[PDB]
Amino acid sequence: QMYDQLSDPFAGLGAGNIHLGYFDGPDDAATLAEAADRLTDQLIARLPVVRDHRVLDVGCGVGKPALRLAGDLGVRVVGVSISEAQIGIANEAARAAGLADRVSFRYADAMRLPFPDASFDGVWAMESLHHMPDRLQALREIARVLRHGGVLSIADFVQLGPVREQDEEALRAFRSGGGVHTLTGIAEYEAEIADAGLTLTSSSDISANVRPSMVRTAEAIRGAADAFLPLMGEEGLRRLIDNFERAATVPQIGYALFAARRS
Ligand SMILES: O=C1NC(=O)c2c1c1c3ccccc3[nH]c1c1c2c2ccccc2n1[C@@H]1O[C@H](CO)[C@@H](O)[C@H](O)[C@H]1O
Ligand SMILES: Nc1ncnc2c1ncn2[C@@H]1O[C@H](CSCC[C@H](N)C(=O)O)[C@@H](O)[C@H]1O
């Protein structure tokens, strides 16, 4: 519901990216849209696939990360989402870049993947698995469609520890507004990957590199009030902004990059 409504405006705050950014710290002079493309690059380093490999983009957004994958690495990409609106935009972006024969997007719920077993050489889940009610079932479906020796690269949120009473309400606003159905610590995350049948190969805590994205995204929204206001209204937009601004006050909100292999 959330996505179909506001995808247009958010996609555009990050050029075509619907995910956060990677900075060298708060005093970094990279644009939000630049920091978003830097995050795509950081996850590409965790996905050792080569030309002609077939990759599944779980939670594809409007397809810019997927298209970047096909351009840099030469992989065929099938992206899945649950927003029919996003899929139509993503497939046209692929037609626009002349990659329709390499990159396609279809409807699919990551918890019941509509693909045969071992049909993909790699899986790519950028900032999407926290929308899953049962994250373990999504990882189990991911391992199933991965061929033996296939690789997985996850970018996602994590909780670095328990939140103090004074920040309880800011966490709750972050989880309800951001659609964060699953949020766990790194230990609990690494354990699920193993329980799904995947052998962990990388684990990067990049929380400090991503935390600025919270504050800077709020500033971009204010600058984009013209695009957001008609779709929400002053009261709805002020709360959206506030959700981000409060989320930045929770230091236990982190971010991790994982890489795994199928046995
Ligand atoms: O509608 C919303 N109400 C919120 O409170 C909201 C909303 C959205 C939203 C709507 C359409 C398309 C993408 C959207 N991202 C939203 C939101 C949030 C939100 C609130 C606090 C902290 C982070 C938040 N983020 C995060 O934004 C990242 C950058 O786009 C996403 O990658 C990440 O998944 C997401 O958690
Ligand atoms: N159960 C589910 N199955 C598949 N995709 C889902 C899903 N729940 C959410 N998504 C999708 O996951 C995406 C989160 S936004 C990340 C989009 C893109 N990969 C990027 O970084 O730009 C959205 O496209 C949303 O529709």
TrEMBL record:
One of its GO terms (biological process) is methylation. InterPro entries: Erg6_SMT_methyltransf, MeTfrase_dom, Methyltransf_11, SAM-dependent_MTases_sf. GO terms for molecular function: metal ion binding; S-adenosylmethionine-dependent methyltransferase activity. This is D-glucose O-methyltransferase. Residues 6-251 form the Polyketide synthase-like methyltransferase domain. It comes from the Bacteria. Mg(2+) 2 binds at N17, E127.
